[PDB]
Coordinates of C-alpha atoms and ligand atoms in Angstrom, one line a residue:
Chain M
X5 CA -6.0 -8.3 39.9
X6 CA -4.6 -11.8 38.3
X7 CA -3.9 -12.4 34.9
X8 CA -4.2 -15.4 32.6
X9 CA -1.7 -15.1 29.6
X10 CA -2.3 -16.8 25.8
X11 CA 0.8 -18.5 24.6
X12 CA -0.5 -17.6 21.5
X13 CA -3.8 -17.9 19.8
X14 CA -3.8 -20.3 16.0
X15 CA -7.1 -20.7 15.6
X16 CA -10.0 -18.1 14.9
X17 CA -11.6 -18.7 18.6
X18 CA -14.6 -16.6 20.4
X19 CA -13.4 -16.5 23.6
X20 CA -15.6 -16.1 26.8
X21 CA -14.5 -14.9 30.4
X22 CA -17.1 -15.1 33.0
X23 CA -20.5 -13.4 31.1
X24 CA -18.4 -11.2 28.5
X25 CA -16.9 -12.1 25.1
X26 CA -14.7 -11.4 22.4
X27 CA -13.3 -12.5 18.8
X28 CA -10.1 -13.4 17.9
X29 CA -8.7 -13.8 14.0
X30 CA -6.6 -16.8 13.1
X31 CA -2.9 -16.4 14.6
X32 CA -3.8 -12.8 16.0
X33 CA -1.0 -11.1 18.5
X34 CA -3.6 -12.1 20.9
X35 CA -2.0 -12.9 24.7
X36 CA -4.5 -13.2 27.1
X37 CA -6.4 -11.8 30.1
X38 CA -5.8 -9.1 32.5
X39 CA -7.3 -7.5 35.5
X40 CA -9.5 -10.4 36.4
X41 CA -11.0 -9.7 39.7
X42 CA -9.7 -11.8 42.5
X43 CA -12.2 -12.6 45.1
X44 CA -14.4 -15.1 42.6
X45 CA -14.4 -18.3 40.5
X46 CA -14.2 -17.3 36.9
X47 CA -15.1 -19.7 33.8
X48 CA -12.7 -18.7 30.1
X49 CA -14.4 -20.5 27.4
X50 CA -14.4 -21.2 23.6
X51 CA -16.1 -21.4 20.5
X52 CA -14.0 -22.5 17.7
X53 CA -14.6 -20.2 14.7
X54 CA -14.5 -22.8 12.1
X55 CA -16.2 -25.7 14.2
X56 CA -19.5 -24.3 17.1
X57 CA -19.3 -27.6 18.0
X58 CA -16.1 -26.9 20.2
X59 CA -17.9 -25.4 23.4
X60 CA -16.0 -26.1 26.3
X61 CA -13.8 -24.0 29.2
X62 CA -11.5 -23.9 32.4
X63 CA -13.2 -22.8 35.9
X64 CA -10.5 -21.5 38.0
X65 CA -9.4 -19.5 41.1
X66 CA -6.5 -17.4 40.2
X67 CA -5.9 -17.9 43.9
X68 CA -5.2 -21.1 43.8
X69 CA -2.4 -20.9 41.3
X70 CA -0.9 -18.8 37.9
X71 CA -3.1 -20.4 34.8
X72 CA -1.9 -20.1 30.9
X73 CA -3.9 -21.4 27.9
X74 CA -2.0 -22.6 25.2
X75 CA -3.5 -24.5 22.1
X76 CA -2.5 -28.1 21.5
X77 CA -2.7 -28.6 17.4
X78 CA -2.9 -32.4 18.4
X79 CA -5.8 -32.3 20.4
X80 CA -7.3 -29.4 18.9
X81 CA -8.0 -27.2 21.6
X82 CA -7.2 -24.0 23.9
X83 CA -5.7 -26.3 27.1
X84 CA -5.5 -24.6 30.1
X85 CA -2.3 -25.6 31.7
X86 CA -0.5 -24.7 35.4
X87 CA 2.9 -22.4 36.1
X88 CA 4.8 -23.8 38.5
X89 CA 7.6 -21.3 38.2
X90 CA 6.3 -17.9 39.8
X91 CA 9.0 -15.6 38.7
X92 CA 8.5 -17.0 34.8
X93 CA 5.2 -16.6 35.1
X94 CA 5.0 -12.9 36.4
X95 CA 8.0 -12.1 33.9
X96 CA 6.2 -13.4 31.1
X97 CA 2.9 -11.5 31.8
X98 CA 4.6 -8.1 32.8
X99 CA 6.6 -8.4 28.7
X100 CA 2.5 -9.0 27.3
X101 CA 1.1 -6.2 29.4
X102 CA 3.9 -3.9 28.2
X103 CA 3.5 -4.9 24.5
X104 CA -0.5 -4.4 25.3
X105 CA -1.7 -8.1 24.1
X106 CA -4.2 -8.4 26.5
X107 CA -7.8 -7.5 26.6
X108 CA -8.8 -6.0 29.8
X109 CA -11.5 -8.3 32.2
X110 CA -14.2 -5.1 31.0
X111 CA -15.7 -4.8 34.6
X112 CA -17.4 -1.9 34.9
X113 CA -18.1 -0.6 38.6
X114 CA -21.4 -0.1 39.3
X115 CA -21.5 -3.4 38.1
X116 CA -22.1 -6.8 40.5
X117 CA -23.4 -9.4 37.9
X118 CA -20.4 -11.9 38.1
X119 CA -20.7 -11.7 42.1
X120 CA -24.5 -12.0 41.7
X121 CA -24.2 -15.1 39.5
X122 CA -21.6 -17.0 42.0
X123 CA -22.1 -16.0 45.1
X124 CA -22.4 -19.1 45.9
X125 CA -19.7 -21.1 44.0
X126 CA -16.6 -22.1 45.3
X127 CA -13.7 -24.2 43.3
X128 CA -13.3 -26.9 46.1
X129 CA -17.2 -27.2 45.6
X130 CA -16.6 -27.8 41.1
X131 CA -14.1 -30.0 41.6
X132 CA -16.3 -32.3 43.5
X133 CA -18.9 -32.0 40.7
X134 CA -15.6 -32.0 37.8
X135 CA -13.4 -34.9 38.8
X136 CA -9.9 -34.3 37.8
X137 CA -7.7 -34.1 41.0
X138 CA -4.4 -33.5 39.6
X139 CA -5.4 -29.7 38.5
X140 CA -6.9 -26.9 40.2
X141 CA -8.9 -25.8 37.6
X142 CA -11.6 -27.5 36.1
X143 CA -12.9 -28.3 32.1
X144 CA -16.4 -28.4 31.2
X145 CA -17.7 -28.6 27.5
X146 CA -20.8 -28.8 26.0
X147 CA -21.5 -32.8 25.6
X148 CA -20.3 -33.5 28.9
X149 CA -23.4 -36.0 30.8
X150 CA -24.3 -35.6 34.2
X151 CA -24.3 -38.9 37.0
X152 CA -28.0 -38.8 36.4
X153 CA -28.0 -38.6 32.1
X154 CA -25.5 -41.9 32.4
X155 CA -28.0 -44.2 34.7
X156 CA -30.8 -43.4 32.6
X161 CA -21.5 -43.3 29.5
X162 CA -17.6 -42.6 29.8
X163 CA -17.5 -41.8 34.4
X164 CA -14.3 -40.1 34.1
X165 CA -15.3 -37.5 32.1
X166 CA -19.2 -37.0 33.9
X167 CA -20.9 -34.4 35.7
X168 CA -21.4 -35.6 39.6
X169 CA -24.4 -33.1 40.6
X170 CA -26.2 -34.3 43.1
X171 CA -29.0 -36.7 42.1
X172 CA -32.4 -35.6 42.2
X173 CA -35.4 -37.8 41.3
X174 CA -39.2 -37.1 42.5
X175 CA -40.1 -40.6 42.1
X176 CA -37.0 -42.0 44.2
X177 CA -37.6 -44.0 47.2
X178 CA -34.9 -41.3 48.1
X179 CA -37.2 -38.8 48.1
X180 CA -40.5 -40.4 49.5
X181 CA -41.0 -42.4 52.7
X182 CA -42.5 -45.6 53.3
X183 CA -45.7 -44.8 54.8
X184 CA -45.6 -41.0 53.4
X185 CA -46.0 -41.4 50.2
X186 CA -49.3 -38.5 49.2
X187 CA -47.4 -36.7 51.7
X188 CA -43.9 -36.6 50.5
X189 CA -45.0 -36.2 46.6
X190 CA -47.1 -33.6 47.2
X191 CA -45.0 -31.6 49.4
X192 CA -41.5 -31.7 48.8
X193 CA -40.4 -30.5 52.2
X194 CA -38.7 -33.7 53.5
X195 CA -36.5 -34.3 50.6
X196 CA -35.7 -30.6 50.4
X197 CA -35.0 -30.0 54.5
X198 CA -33.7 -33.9 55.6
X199 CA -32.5 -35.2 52.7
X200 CA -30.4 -33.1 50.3
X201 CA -30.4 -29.9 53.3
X202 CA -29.7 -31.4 55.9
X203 CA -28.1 -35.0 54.5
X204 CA -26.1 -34.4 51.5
X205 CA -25.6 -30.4 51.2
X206 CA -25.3 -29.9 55.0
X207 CA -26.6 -26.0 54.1
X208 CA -28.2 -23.9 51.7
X209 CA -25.3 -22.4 50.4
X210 CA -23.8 -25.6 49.2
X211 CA -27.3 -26.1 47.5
X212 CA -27.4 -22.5 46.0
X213 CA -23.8 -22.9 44.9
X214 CA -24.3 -26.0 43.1
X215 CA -27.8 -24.9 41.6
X216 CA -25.6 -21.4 40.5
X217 CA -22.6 -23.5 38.8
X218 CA -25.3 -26.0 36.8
X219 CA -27.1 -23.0 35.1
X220 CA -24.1 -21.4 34.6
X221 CA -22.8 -24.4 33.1
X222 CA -26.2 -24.5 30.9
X223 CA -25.9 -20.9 29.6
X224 CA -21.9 -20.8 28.6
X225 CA -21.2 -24.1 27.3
X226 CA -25.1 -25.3 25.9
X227 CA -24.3 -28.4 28.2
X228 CA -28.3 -29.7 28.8
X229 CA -27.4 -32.1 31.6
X230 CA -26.8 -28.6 33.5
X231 CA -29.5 -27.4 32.8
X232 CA -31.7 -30.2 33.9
X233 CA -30.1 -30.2 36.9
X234 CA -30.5 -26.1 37.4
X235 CA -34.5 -26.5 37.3
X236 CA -34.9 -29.9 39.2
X237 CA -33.1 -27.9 42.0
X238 CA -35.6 -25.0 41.7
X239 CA -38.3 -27.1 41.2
X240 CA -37.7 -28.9 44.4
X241 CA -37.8 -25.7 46.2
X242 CA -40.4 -24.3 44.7
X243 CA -42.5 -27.2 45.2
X244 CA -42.0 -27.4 49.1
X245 CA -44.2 -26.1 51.4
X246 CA -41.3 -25.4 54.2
X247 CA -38.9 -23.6 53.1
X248 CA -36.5 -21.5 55.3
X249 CA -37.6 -17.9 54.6
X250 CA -33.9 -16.7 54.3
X251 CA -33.6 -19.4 51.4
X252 CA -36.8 -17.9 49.9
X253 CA -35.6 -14.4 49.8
X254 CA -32.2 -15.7 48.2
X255 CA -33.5 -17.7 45.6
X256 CA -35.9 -15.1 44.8
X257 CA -32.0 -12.9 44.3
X258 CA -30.3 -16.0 42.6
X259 CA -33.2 -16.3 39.9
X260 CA -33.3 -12.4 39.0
X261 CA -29.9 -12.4 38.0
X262 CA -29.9 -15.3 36.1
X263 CA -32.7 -14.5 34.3
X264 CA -31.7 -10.6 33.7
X265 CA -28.1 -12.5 32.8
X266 CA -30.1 -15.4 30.1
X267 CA -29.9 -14.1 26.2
X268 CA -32.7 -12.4 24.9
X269 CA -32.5 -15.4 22.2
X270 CA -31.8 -18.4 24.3
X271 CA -35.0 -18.5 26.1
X272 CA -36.3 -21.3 23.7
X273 CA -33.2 -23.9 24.7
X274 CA -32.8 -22.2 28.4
X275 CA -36.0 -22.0 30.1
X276 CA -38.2 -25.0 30.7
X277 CA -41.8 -23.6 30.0
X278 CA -43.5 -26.2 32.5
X279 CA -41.0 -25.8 35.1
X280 CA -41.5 -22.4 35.6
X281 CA -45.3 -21.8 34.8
X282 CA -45.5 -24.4 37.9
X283 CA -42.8 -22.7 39.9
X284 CA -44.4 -19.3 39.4
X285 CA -48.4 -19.9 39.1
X286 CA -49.0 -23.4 40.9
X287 CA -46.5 -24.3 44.0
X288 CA -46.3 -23.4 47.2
X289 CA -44.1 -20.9 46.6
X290 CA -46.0 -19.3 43.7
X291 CA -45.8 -16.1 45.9
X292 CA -42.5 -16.3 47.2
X293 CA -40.8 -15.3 44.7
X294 CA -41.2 -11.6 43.7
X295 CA -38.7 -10.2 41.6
X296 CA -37.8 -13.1 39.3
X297 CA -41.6 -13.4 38.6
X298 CA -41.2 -9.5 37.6
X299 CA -38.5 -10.1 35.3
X300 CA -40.0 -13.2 33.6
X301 CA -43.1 -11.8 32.8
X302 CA -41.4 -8.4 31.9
X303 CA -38.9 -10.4 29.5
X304 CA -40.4 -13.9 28.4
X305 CA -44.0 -13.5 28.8
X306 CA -44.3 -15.7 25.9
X307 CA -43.2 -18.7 27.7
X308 CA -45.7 -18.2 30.6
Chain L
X1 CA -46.1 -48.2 27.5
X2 CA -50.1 -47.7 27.0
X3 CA -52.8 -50.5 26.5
X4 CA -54.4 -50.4 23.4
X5 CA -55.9 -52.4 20.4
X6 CA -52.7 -53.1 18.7
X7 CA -51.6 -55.1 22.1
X8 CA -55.3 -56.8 23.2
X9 CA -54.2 -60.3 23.4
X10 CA -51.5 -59.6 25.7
X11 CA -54.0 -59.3 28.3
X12 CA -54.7 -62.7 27.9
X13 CA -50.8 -64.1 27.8
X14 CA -49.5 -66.3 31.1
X15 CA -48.0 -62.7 32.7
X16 CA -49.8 -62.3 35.7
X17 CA -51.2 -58.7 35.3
X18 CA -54.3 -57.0 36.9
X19 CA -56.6 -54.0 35.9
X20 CA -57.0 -51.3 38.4
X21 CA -60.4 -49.0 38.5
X22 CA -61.1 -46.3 40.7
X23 CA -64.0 -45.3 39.2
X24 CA -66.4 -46.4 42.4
X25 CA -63.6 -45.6 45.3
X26 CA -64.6 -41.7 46.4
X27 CA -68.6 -41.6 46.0
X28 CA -71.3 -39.1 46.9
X29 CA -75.1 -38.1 47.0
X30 CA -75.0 -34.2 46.5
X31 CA -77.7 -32.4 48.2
X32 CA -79.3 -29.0 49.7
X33 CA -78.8 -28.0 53.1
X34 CA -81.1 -26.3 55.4
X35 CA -79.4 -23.3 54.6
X36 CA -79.7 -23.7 51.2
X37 CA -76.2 -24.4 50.5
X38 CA -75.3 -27.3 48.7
X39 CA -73.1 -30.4 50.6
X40 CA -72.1 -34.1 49.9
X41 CA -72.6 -37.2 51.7
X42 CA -70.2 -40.3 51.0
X43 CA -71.3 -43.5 50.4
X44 CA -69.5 -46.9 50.6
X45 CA -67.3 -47.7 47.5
X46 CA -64.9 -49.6 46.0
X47 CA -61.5 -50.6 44.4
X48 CA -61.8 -53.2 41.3
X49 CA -59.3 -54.8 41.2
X50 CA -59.1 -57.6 38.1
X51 CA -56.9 -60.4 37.0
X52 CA -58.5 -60.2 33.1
X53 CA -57.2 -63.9 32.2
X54 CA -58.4 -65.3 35.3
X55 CA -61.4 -63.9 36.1
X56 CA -60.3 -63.2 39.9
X57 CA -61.7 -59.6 41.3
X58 CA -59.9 -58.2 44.3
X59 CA -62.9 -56.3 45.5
X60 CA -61.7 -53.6 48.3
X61 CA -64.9 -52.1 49.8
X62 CA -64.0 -48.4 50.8
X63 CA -66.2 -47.8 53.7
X64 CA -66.9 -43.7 54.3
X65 CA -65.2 -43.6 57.6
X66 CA -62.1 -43.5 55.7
X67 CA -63.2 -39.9 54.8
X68 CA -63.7 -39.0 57.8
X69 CA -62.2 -35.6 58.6
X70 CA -60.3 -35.4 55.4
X71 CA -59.8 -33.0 53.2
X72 CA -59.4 -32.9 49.2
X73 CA -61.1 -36.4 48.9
X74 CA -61.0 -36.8 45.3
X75 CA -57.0 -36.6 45.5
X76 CA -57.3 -38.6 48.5
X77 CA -58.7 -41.3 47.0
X78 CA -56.3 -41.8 44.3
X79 CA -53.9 -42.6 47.0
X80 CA -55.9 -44.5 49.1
X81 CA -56.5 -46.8 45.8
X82 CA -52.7 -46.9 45.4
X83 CA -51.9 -47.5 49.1
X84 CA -54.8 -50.6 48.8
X85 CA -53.2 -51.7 45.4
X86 CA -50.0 -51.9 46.7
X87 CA -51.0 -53.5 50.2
X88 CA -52.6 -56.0 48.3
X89 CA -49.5 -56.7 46.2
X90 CA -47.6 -57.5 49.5
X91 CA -49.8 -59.9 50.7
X92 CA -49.6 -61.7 47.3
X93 CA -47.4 -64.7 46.9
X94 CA -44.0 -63.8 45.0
X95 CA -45.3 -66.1 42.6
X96 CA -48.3 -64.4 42.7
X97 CA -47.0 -60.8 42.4
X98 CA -48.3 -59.0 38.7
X99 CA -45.9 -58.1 36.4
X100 CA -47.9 -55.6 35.0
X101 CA -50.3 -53.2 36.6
X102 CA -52.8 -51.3 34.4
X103 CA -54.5 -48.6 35.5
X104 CA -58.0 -47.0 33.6
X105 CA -57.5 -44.0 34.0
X106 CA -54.1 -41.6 33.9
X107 CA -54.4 -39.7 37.2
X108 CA -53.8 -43.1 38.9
X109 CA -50.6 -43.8 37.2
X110 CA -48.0 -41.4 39.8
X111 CA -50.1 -42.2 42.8
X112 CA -49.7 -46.0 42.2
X113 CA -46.1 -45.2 40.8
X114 CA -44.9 -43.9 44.0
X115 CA -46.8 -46.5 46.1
X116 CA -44.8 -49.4 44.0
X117 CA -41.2 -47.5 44.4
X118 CA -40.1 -51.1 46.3
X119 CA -41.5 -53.1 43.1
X120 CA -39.3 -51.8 40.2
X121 CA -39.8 -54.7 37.8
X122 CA -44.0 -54.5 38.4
X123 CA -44.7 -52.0 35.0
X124 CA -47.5 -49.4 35.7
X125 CA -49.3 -48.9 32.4
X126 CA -52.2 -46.7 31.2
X127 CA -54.5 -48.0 29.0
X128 CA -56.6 -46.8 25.7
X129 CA -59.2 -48.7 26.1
X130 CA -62.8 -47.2 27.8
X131 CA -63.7 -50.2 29.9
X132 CA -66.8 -49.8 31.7
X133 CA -65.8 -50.8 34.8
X134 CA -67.5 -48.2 36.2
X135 CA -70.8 -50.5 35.8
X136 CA -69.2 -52.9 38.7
X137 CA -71.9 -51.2 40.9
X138 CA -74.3 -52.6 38.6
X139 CA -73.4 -56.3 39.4
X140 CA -76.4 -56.7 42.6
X141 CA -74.2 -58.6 44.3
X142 CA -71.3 -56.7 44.2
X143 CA -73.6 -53.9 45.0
X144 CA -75.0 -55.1 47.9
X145 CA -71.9 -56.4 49.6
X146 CA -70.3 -52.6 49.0
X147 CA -73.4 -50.9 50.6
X148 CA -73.8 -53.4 53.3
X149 CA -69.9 -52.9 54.7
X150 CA -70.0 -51.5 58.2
X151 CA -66.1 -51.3 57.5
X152 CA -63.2 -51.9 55.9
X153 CA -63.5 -55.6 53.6
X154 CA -61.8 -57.3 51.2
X155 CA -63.6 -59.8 49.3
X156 CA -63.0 -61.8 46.8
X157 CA -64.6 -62.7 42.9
X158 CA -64.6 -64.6 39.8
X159 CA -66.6 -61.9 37.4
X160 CA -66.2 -64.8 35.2
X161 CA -68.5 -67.1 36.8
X162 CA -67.5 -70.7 35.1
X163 CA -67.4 -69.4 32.1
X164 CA -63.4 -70.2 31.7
X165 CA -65.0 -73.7 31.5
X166 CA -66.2 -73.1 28.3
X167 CA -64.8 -70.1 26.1
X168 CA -61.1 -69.1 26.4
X169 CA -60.2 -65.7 28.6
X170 CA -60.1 -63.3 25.6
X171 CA -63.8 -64.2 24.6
X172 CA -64.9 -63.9 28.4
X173 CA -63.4 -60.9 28.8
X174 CA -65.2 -59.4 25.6
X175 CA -68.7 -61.1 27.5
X176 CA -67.8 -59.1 30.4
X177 CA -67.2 -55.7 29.4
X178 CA -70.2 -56.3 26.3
X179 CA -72.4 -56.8 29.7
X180 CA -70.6 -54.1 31.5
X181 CA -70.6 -51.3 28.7
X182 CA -74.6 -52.8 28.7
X183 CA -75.4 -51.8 32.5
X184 CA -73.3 -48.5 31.8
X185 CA -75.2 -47.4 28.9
X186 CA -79.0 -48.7 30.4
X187 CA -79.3 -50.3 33.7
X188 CA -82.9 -51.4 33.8
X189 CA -82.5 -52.6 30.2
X190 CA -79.5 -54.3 30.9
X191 CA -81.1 -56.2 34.1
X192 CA -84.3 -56.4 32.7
X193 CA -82.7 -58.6 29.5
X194 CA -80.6 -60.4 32.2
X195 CA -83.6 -61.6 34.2
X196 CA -86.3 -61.3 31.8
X197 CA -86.6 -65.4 31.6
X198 CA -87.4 -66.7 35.5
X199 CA -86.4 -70.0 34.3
X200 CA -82.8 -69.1 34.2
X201 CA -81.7 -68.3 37.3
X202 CA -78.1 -66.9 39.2
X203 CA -76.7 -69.8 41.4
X204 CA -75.8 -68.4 45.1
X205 CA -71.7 -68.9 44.0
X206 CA -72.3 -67.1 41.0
X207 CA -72.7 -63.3 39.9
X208 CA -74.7 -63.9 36.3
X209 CA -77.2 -66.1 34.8
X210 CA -76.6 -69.6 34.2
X211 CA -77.3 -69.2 30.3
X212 CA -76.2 -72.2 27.9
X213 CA -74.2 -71.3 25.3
X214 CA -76.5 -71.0 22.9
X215 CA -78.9 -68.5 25.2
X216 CA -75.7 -66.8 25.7
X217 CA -75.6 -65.5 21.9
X218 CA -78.8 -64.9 22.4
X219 CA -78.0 -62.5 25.2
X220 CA -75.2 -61.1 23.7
X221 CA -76.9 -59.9 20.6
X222 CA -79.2 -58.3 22.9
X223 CA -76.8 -56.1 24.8
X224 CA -75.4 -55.3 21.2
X225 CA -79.2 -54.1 20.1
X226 CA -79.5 -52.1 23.1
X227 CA -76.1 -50.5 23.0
X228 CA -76.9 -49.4 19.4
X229 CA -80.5 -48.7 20.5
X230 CA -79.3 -46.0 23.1
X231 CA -76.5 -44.7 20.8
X232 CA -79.1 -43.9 18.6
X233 CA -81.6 -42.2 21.0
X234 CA -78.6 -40.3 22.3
X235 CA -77.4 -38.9 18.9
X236 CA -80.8 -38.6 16.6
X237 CA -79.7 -41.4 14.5
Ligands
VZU1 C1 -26.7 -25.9 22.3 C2 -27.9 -25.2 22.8 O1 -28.6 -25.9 23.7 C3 -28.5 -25.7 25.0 O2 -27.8 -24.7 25.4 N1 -29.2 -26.5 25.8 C4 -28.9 -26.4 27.2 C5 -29.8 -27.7 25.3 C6 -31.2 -27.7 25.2 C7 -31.8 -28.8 24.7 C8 -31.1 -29.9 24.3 N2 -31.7 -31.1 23.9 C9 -29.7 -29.9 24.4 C10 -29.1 -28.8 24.9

């Protein structure tokens, strides 16, 4: 299990790690993170106390290095910042965990949400999407735009998911035009499959870190980019069966994962009454159309 | 955006722009069978095509071998109409090309979308206007040239006759859908108001009467009476 230390914590902050959170008061002995499970990406976020319009966070791999927050009173924010030094680094965890300033990464162990949600994600894949070589880890905030959002401003600081447009000559060809807008399949199976993805695990990993992305920071770029890639799916007549039966998966736990109160700025009502009731694949997908109707039966 | 009141006279500015009606393209008898089942039979149609400030119709006669072994036809036929739309556009001149495409009714607006990806800078545009050019089939010469196709045609129209000649493009444009609304709303009354006087006759390059102006008010006040005539039959009034 890794750990991810606080320098210290000067601002009243709600702090998020992967799909649990926590308070913490104005300059409380606060000091971090332990027993984060190694074997996934994780995501520690923020919600300033006395401003909700800081939402942003750090996706990291504590394999790939020893990660700290500190806060920068210039800036104004929880940075997250690498440790070089690997004996300062483990000394300086081991005197928090003895003093017990550290909340524990509350896992319990029946429990395989976080897996469930990124099974799919890899860090080498966000820092394609987040471009900032010169860290490992990678900051995402709520007002961050996608590639798409800006051609339709700053690049640096953008969202490169992979554009998806119905009415693209990208995704119709010359010659098949009914054909191609009424069944997705090509630009699903040649294009982004086979083309710009190279497999469905790419796909499902990208389509897993936008509605994550959606759901912890509020960014709506994400999650316009989340349903387009369902859609697309959804409204293909040939789909792989083994990438039915996992999307069916992906869905379920994101919607068994989405707040109860969030449905109204999560959940795209056409999108889904189309992908559930109308497309080729109304049928295909069993469980999540159990838990939507279960749990938002409003929207549908 | 949409095409509307507000915005009339721009149909009449120097940007080339055309109506599009599908109305006529996908068209059927529907009868009995021996079985007593009921089934269709297509007949010829068409594409209308119009150039509003010029008067030019781009007439595509859809002949019913083009159904032939298909299936959903009423879908079909909105992309057929596109394909034909935007084939037509290709074999334009440059100079030529519309900047503006407006179609009559909104199911035609992805079809001919998609068909136009290559044209970004041609704008495809609903419309709020009711234009009856669902009537075209009304015009007997139009008419006949649709129903006599033995295949695919393309032929071409001024559904302005010379009237250009005389009244500007935004007062023959309100002559021709006055007519058209006219053969919509009662064909024989229409015709028979159209033909009533032998002595005015339709020259062979010509589609309507060869009224003078002043029989032309005549005519027009006509169509007005029996547009408000129907109305009221329809509604008790
Ligand atoms: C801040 C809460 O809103 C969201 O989480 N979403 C994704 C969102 C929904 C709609 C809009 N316009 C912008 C953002």
């Amino acid at each position: 299990m890794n750990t991810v230390p606080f320098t210290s914590a000067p601002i009243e902050v709600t702090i998020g790690i992967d799909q649990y959170s926590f308070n913490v008061k104005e300059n409380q002995p606060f000091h971090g993170i332990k027993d984060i499970p190694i074997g996934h990406v994780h995501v520690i976020h923020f919600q300033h106390a006395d401003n909700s319009s800081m939402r942003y966070g750090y996706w990291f791999d504590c394999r790939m290095g020893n990660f700290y927050i500190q806060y920068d009173p210039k800036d104004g924010l929880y940075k997250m910042m690498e440790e070089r030094d690997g004996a300062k680094f483990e000394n300086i965890v081991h005197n928090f965990k003895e003093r017990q300033m550290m909340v524990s990464y509350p896992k319990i162990d029946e429990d395989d949400t976080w897996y469930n949600l990124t099974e799919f994600v890899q860090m080498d894949k966000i820092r394609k999407i987040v471009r900032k070589d010169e860290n490992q880890f990678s900051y995402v905030d709520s007002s961050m735009t996608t590639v798409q959002e800006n051609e339709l401003s700053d690049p640096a600081h953008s969202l490169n998911y992979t554009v998806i447009n119905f009415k693209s000559r990208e995704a119709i060809r010359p010659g098949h035009e009914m054909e191609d807008f009424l069944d997705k399949s090509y630009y699903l199976n040649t294009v982004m499959l086979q083309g710009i993805f190279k497999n469905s695990s790419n796909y499902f990993g990208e389509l897993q870190f936008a509605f994550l992305n959606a759901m912890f920071f509020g960014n709506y770029g994400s999650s316009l980019q989340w349903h387009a890639m369902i859609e697309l799916i959804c409204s293909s007549a040939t789909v792989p069966k083994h990438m039915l039966d996992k999307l069916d998966e992906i869905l379920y736990y994101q919607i068994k994962t989405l707040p109860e109160q969030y449905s109204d700025i999560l959940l795209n009502e056409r999108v889904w009454n189309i992908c559930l009731y109308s497309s080729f694949q109304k049928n295909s997908l069993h469980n999540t159309e159990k838990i939507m109707e279960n749990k938002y039966p409003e929207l549908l | 955006g949409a095409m509307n009141s507000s915005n009339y006279a721009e149909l009449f500015n120097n940007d080339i722009k055309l109506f599009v009606d599908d109305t006529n393209v996908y068209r059927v008898t529907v009868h009995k069978t021996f079985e007593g089942n009921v089934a269709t039979k297509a007949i010829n149609g068409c594409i209308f095509t119009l150039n509003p400030k010029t008067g030019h119709l781009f007439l595509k006669i859809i002949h019913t071998s083009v159904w032939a072994g298909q299936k959903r036809l009423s879908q079909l036929a909105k992309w057929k109409t596109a394909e034909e739309v935007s084939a037509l556009v290709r074999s334009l001149p440059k100079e030529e090309q519309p900047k503006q495409i407006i179609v009559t009714r909104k199911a035609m607006l992805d079809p001919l979308e998609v068909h136009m990806l290559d044209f970004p800078n041609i704008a495809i545009r609903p419309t709020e206007l009711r234009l009856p050019f669902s009537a075209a089939m009304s015009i007997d010469k139009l008419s006949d040239v649709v129903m006599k196709a033995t295949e695919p045609q393309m032929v071409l129209f001024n559904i302005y006759d010379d009237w250009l000649d005389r009244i500007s493009s935004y007062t023959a444009f309100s002559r021709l859908t006055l007519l058209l609304r006219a053969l919509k709303t009662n064909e024989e009354s229409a015709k028979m108001i159209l033909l009533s006087d032998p002595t005015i006759t339709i020259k062979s390059y010509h589609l309507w009467p060869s009224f003078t102006d002043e029989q032309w008010i005549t005519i027009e006040s006509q169509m007005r009476d029996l547009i408000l005539t129907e109305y009221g039959r329809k509604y008790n009034v």
